[PDB]
Short mmCIF file of C-alpha atoms (C1' of nucleotides) in Angstrom, two decimals:
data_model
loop_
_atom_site.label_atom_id
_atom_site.label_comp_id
_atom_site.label_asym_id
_atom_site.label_seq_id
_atom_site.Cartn_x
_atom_site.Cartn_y
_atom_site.Cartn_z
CA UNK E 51 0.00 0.00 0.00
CA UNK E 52 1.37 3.58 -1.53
CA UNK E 53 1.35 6.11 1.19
CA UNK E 54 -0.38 9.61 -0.27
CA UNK E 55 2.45 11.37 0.88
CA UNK E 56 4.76 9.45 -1.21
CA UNK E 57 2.15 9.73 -4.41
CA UNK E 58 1.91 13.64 -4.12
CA UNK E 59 5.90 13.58 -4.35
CA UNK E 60 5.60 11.37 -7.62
CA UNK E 61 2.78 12.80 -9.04
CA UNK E 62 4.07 16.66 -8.73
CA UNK E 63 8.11 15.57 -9.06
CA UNK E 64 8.97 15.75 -5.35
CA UNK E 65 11.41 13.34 -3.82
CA UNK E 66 10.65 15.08 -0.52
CA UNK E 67 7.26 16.27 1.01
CA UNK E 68 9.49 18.79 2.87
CA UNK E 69 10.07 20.26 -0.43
CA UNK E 70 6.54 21.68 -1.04
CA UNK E 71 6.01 23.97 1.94
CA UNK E 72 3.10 25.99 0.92
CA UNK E 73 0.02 24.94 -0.20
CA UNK E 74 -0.61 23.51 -3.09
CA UNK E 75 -1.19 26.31 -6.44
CA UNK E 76 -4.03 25.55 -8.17
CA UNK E 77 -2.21 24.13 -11.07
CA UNK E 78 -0.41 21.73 -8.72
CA UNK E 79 -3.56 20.68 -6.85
CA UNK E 80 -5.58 19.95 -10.35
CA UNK E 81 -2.68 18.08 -11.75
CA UNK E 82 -3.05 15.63 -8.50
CA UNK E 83 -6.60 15.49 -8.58
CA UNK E 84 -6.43 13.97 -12.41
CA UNK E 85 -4.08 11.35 -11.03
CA UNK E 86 -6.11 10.07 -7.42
CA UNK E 87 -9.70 11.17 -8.47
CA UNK E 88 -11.28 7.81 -8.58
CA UNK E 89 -8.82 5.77 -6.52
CA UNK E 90 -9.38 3.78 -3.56
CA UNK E 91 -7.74 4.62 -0.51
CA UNK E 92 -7.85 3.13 2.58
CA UNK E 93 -7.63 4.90 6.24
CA UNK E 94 -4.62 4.73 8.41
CA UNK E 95 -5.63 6.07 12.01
CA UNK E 96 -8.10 3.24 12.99
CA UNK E 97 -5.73 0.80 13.50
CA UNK E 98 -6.29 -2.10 11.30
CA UNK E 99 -10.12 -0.69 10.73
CA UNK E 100 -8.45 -0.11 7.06
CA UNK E 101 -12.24 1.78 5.78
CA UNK E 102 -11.78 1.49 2.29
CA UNK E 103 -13.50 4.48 0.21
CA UNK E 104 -13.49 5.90 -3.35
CA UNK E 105 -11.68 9.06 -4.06
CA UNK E 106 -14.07 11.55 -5.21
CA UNK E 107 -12.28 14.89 -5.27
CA UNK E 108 -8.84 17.06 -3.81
CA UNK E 109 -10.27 20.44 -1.15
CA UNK E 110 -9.06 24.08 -2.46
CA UNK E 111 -8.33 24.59 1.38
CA UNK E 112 -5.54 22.83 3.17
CA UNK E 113 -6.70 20.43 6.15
CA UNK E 114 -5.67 23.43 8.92
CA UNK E 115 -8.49 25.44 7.27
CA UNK E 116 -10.77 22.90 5.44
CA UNK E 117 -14.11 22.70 7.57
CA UNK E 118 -17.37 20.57 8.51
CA UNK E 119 -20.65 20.78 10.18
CA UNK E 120 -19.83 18.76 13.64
CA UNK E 121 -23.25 18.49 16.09
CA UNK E 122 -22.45 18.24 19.76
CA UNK E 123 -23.77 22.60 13.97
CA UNK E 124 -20.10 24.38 15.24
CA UNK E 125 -18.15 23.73 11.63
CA UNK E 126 -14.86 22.71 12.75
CA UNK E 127 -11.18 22.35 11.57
CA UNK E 128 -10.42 19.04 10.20
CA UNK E 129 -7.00 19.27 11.63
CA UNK E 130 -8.99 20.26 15.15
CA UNK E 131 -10.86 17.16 14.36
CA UNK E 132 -7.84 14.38 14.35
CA UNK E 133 -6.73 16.43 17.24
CA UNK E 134 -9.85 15.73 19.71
CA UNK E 135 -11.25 12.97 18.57
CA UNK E 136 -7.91 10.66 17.07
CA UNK E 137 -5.54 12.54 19.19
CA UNK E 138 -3.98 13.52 16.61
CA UNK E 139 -1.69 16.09 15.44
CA UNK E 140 -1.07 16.00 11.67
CA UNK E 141 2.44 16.92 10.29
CA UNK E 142 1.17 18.39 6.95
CA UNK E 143 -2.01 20.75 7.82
CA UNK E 144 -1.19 22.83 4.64
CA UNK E 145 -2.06 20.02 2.37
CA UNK E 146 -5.35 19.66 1.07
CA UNK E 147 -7.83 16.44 1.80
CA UNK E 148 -9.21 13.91 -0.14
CA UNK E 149 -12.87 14.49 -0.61
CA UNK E 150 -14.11 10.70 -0.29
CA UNK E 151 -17.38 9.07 -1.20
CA UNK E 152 -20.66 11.16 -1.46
CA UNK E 153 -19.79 15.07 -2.17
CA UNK E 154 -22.69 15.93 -0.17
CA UNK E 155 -21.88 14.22 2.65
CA UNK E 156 -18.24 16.58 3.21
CA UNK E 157 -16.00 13.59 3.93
CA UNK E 158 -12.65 14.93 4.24
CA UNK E 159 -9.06 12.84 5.17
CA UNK E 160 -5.76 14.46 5.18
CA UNK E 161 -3.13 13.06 2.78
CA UNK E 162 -1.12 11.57 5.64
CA UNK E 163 -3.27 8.90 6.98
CA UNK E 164 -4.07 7.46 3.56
CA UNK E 165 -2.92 4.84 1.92
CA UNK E 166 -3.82 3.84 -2.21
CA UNK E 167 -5.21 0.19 -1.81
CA UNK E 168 -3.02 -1.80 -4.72
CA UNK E 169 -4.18 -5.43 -3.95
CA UNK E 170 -5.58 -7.80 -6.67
CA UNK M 225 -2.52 -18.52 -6.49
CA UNK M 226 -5.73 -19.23 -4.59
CA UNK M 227 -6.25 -22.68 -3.23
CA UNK M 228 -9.17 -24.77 -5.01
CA UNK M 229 -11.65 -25.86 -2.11
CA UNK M 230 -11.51 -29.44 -4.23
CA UNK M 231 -7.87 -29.80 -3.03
CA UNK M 232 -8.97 -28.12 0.23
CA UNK M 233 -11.35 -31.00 1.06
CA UNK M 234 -9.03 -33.60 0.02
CA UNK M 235 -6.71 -32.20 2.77
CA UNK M 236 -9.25 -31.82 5.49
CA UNK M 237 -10.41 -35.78 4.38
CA UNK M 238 -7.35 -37.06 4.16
CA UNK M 239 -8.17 -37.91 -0.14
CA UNK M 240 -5.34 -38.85 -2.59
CA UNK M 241 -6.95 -37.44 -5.14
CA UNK M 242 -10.90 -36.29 -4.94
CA UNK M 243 -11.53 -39.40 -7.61
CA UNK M 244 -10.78 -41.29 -4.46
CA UNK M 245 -14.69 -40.02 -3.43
CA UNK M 246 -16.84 -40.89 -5.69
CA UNK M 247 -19.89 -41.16 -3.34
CA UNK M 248 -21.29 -37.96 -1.56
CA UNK M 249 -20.39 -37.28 1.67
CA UNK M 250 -21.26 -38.96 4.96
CA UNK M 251 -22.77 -36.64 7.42
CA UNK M 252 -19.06 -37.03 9.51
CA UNK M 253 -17.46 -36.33 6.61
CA UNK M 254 -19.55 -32.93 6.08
CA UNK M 255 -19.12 -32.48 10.10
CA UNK M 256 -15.70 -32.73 9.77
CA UNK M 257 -15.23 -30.83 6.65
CA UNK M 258 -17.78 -27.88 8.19
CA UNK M 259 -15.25 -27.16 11.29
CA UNK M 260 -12.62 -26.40 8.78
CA UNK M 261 -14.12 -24.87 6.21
CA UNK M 262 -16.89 -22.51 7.73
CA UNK M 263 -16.01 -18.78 7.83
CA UNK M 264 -13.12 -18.39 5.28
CA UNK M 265 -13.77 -16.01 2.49
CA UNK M 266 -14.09 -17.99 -1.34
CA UNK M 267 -13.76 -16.42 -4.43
CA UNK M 268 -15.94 -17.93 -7.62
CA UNK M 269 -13.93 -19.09 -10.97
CA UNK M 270 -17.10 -19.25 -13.01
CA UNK M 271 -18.40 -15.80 -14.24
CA UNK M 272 -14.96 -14.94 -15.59
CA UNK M 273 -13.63 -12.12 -14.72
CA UNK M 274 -16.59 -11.35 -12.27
CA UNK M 275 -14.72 -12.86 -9.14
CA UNK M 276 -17.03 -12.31 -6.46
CA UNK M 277 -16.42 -13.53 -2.76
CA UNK M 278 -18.26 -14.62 -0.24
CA UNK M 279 -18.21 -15.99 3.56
CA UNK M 280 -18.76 -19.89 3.85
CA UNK M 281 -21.51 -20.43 6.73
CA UNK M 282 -22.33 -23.88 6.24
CA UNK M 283 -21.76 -26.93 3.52
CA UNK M 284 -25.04 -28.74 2.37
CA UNK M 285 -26.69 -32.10 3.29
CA UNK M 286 -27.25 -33.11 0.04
CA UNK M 287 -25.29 -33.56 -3.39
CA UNK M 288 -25.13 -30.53 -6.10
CA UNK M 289 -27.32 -32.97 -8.15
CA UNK M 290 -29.92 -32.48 -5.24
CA UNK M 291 -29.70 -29.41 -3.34
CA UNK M 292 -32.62 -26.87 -3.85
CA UNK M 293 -33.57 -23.84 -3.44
CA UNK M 294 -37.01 -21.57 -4.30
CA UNK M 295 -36.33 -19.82 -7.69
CA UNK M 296 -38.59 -17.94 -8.79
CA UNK M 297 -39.71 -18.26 -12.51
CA UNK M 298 -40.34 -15.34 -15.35
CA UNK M 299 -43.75 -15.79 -14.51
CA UNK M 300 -44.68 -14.70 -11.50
CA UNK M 301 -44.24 -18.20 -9.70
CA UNK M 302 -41.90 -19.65 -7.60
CA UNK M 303 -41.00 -23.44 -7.68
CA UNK M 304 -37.49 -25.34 -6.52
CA UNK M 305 -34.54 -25.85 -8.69
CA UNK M 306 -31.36 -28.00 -7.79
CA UNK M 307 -28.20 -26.07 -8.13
CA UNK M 308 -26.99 -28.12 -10.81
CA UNK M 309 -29.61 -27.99 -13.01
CA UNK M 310 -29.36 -24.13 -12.02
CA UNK M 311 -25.73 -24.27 -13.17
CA UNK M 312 -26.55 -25.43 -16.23
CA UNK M 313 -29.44 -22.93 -17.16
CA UNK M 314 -27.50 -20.15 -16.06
CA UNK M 315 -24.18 -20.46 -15.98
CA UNK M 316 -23.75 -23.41 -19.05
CA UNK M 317 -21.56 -25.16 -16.77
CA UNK M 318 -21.96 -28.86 -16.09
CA UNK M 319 -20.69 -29.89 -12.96
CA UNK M 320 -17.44 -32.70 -12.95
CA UNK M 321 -18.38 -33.50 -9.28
CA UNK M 322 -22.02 -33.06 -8.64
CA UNK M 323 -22.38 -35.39 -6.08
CA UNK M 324 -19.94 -33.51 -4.08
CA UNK M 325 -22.07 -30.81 -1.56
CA UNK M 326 -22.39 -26.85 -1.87
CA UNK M 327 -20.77 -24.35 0.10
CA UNK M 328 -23.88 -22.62 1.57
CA UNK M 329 -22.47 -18.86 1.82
CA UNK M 330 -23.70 -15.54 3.83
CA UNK M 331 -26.88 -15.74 5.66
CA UNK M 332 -28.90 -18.99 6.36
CA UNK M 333 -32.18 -17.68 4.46
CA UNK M 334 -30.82 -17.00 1.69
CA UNK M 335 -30.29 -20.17 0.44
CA UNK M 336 -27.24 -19.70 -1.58
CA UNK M 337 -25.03 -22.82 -2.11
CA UNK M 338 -21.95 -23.05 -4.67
CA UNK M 339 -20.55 -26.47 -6.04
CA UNK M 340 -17.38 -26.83 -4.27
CA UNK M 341 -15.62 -26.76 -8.03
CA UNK M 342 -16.50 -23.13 -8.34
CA UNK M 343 -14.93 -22.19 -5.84
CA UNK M 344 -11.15 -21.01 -4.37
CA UNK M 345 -10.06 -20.09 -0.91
CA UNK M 346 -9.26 -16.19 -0.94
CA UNK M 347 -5.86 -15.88 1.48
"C1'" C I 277 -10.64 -5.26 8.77
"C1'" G I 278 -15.90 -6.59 9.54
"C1'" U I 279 -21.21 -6.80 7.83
"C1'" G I 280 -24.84 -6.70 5.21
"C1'" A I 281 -27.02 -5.13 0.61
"C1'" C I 282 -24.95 -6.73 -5.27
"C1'" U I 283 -25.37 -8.13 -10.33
"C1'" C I 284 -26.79 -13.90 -6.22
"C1'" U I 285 -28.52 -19.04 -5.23
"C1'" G D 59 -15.65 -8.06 -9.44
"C1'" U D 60 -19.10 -2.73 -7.50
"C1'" G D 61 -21.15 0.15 -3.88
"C1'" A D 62 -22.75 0.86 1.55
"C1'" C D 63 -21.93 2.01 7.06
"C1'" U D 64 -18.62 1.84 12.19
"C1'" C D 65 -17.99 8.61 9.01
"C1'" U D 66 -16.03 13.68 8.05
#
RNA sequence: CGUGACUCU
RNA sequence: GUGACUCU
């Protein structure tokens, strides 16, 4: 199983991630989309819960801004989110998220904890 | 390379070869066969390229040749078919071992069953 | 990974 | 082999 972190690098001619700082231009973050729109990728930060789900787009906003309606609606931070409820503090907030699964339904995973399901 | 459940069963029985049996099985030898086989995924080798899995919860009492289930016809009705009759309607495939049992696969009530020459063990 | 629904049986 | 939920 690829790491995203390691496909961004290939796909946009990194060999490091700590060589794209910034977020991602526009340019950069279409020419990634055309490569994992429509991949599957499976989850990372469930332990071996490996959810499997369809990539359906690439955010504009990088994870540290990127939001969603959370109900306990105060539209939160998906960074904030890995934070509270995964205890988890990503490493790469200015990268976008993957957009899995139903566009309406705003599902939203940082590049980090994914991995591109090869298999047979 | 996924494992045939023909040479499967010939492991669990202690067979040579599965020309060895060519009776069906003896309820212990469908006992036995059950402990081993029940709950490990299978993949199907018969609608080409379409190889879909399932989860084995049983193996049948009876013989391919007898085992039915309630098909309903392109009428309205429903009557009972044997699966290898089905497997011939359907799937123009005529069993080499039909009196060899089914794998019956997810949920009791649905009443599926595949010939055990259909199928491979999925790691 | 697991469960169902699935193109099944 | 496809999609679904333990989500975000």
């Amino acid at each position: 199983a690829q790491p995203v972190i390691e496909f961004v690098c290939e796909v946009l001619d990194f060999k490091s991630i700590e060589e794209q700082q910034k977020p991602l231009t526009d340019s950069q973050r279409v020419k990634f989309t055309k490569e994992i729109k429509g991949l599957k990728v499976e989850i990372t930060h469930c332990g071996q819960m490996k959810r499997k789900y369809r990539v359906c787009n690439v955010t504009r906003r990088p994870a540290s801004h990127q939001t969603f309606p959370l109900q306990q609606t105060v539209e939160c931070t998906v960074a904030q989110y890995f934070k509270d409820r995964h205890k988890l503090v990503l490493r790469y907030p200015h990268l976008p998220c993957l957009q899995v699964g139903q566009e309406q339904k705003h599902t939203y995973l940082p590049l980090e904890v994914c991995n591109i399901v090869a298999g047979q």
